[PDB]
Amino acid sequence: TCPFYKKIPGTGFTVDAFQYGVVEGCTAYFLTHFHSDHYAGLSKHFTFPVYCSEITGNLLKNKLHVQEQYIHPLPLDTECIVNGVKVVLLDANHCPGAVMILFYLPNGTVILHTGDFRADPSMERSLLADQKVHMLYLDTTYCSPEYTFPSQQEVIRFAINTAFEAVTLNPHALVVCGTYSIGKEKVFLAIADVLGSKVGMSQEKYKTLQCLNIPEINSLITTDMCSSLVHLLPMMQINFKGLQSHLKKCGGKYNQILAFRPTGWTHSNKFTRIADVIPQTKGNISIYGIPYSEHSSYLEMKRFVQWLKPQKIIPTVNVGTWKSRSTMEKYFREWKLEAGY
């Protein structure tokens, strides 16, 4: 059964609600982004309208085989009417195609669903500017002050510099990057660019990247592994056993692997600054875990909410324990008292 924090009161709409069968009274199903916990249940057999971004629609058609007659892509930053209700899609700064959804209800109430997002000051100059919001459905993944991590730019600078130094010292080194979904493409694209290489990958992963409207993509990626010195592998293979195995398949073209494992937050962010990060090493293989987040830090989330000044907040993550729920509610009250709304 579909939970309350996925229902839009006063409409026939749901958000990211595909795993509950036919939802009673739902005439339009919105999808914020193409991550499996959110799309769970969608397939070629789905026969109701799905509203989403153009990139999300390309992935629905090509990867899940959803029939084209049921895919309703909407442009960003544009007032659209769906089933008699004005809606707007905004960039979420999450993975490719990810959106936040603004709903202008018939009764005059205004609701923002963030989906998954990494809050940024640039969102203060979207169509949200000077817009009253009555209800905010908030991605609270990292809603506690312990959750700190660097900017995406700082993490990419570290990765580029690390890879360039390694391959300049040893021209026979291979660089490997782990992946398990869409998102975090900048990690492998930035490394390949500094090295003058295309990124090599499986046919399945190539198909996924061909759906993302990335400019000049044919110049950047390939299924010919042997022409490339930056390879993508599934995240589960980025360990000493899996990398040793991969090194054998390249036919003595390479004599060293440098691998990156993009993670979210980890506890080492408490103690170790990104510049000070060191790898796990065994012989000619080194593995770097790098904290490349596509969710708001605590500080980023607090800034966004204090600027927006919503009347009510409904968390959508960490809602399953009394302790977690209470912790988030205490921070929302602090933020409101500090800012005066």
Ligand X SMILES: c1ccc(CN2CCC(n3cccc3)CC2)cc1
Q: Both ends of the chain: CA-CA distance in Å?
A: 35
338 binds, among Ni ion, ligand X, none (CB under 5 to 8 A by kind): none
116 binds, among ligand X, Ni ion, none (CB under 5 to 8 A by kind): Ni ion
DSSP secondary structure string for all residues of 210-258: HTS--TTGGGTEES-GGG-SEEEEEGGG-SHHHHHHHHHHTTSS-SEEE
Residues 144-203 that bind ligand X (CB under 6 A): 144, 146
Instruction: State how far the Cα of 208 lies from the Cα of 225, in Å rounded to an integer.
Output: 17
From 73, 318, 335, 336, residue interacting with ligand X (rule: CB under 6 A): 318
Amino acid at 204: E
Contact characters 10-49, Ni ion, x per CB under 5 A: -------------------------x--------------
Of residues 115 and 310, the one with the C-beta less far from Ni ion: 115
| 327: contact with ligand X by CB under 6 A | yes
Binding segment (CB under 5 A) for Ni ion, from list 54-62, 116-124, 186-194, 215-223: 116-124
Of residues 36 and 144, the one with the C-beta less far from ligand X: 144
Instruction: State how far the Cα of 219 lies from the Cα of 202, in Å rounded to an integer.
Output: 16
Instruction: State how far the Cα of 246 lies from the Cα of 243, in Å rounded to an integer.
Output: 5
CB of 315 to ligand X, least distance (A): 8
| 263: contact with ligand X by CB under 6 A | no
Residue 20 in contact with residue 41, Cβ under 8 Å?
A: yes
Structure tokens that stand for 328 in this block: 């988030």
Amino acid at 238: I
CA 27 and chain centroid, separation: 27
Of residues 263 and 324, the one with the C-beta less far from ligand X: 324
Please give the size of the binding site for ligand X, defined by CB under 6 A: 8
Sheet architecture: strand order including 99-104? 80-82, 85-91, 99-104, 110-113, 135-138, 312-315
35 binds, among ligand X, Ni ion, none (CB under 5 to 8 A by kind): Ni ion
CB of 313 to ligand X, least distance (A): 13
| 328: contact with ligand X by CB under 6 A | yes
CB of 269 to Ni ion, least distance (A): 20
**Which residues make up the interface to Ni ion (CB under 5 A)?**
35, 116
Contacting residues toward ligand X, per CB under 6 A: 143-144, 146, 267, 318, 324, 327-328
